[model samples]
Target: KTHVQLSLPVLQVRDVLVRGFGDSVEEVLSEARQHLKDGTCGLVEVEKGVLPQLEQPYVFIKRSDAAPHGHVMVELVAELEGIQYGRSGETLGVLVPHVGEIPVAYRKVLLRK
Candidate 1:
């Protein structure tokens, strides 16, 4: 099995994360992805973590390349959130269990042993 770290939101730091960054948190995170190229500085810094991982919350999918070497991954945890800016506020970041990860949502993904 492969490891899928969680990527949640950080709305509290909108000010800290938006000083000279994107207007919105989501957009900030998108650029945050870009920042990762060098060393992200967009936003989303909530708390300290140990690279939290998943075990069985991901869905079946295809792989990029077929190396067929093995499984059990130890991916990175992007502690960033993709806010669903809308009229109705909803969906707390991770720390809860969901079947599959939503791309538009906030999750790199996880699980299954």
Candidate 2:
């Protein structure tokens, strides 16, 4: 068995947090592909001039089984600069779970386990 870790952007839309995961990059990409095919993927922007820059989001996975198992341990690291931005009319950021889309403004990182 092998362990892999990937850093990627997650979305904080208003109050809800969204993220994506799969056994491999292909799995995640497949989800994205399906969303694109369904025409559910679109660009969304966070409210400007109010929200502070967001901390990076990441995903970590540890597997004890071999490949093609489709089951493993997963961890998601999501952090925010603060929660005050969403209290007002300003939105922190955007997220389209169907397509695994997060604004470039947010940060991301990756590693191996």
Each prediction's TM-score against the native? 0.23, 0.27
- What is the C-alpha lDDT profile of model 1 across 55-113, one tens digit per residue? 11211112232222232221222223432322212212322222232223333322111
> Candidate 2 regions off by >4 Å?
1-17, 42-95, 98-113
Q: Please, what is the whole-model Cα lDDT of each candidate in the order they appear?
A: 0.28, 0.32
Model 1, position 24, has a per-residue lDDT of: 44
Give the clashing pairs for model 2: 7-109, 7-110
Which pairs clash (backbone N, Cα, C closer than 3 Å) in model 1? 1-72, 8-80, 8-81, 9-81, 55-111, 55-112, 56-111, 56-112
The candidate that achieves the highest TM-score relative to the unseen native structure: 2
**Residue 26 accuracy (lDDT) in model 1:** 46
- Against the true structure, whose lDDT is highest? 2
Worst 10 residues of 2 by lDDT: 83-92
Candidate 1: lDDT over CA atoms? 0.28
Alpha-carbon runs more than 4 Å astray in model 1: 1-20, 40-113
lDDT of 2 by residue, 1-113 (tens): 23333223434444223343233444544443344346443223445631233222212122223222332333222223331211122221332343444444432212112
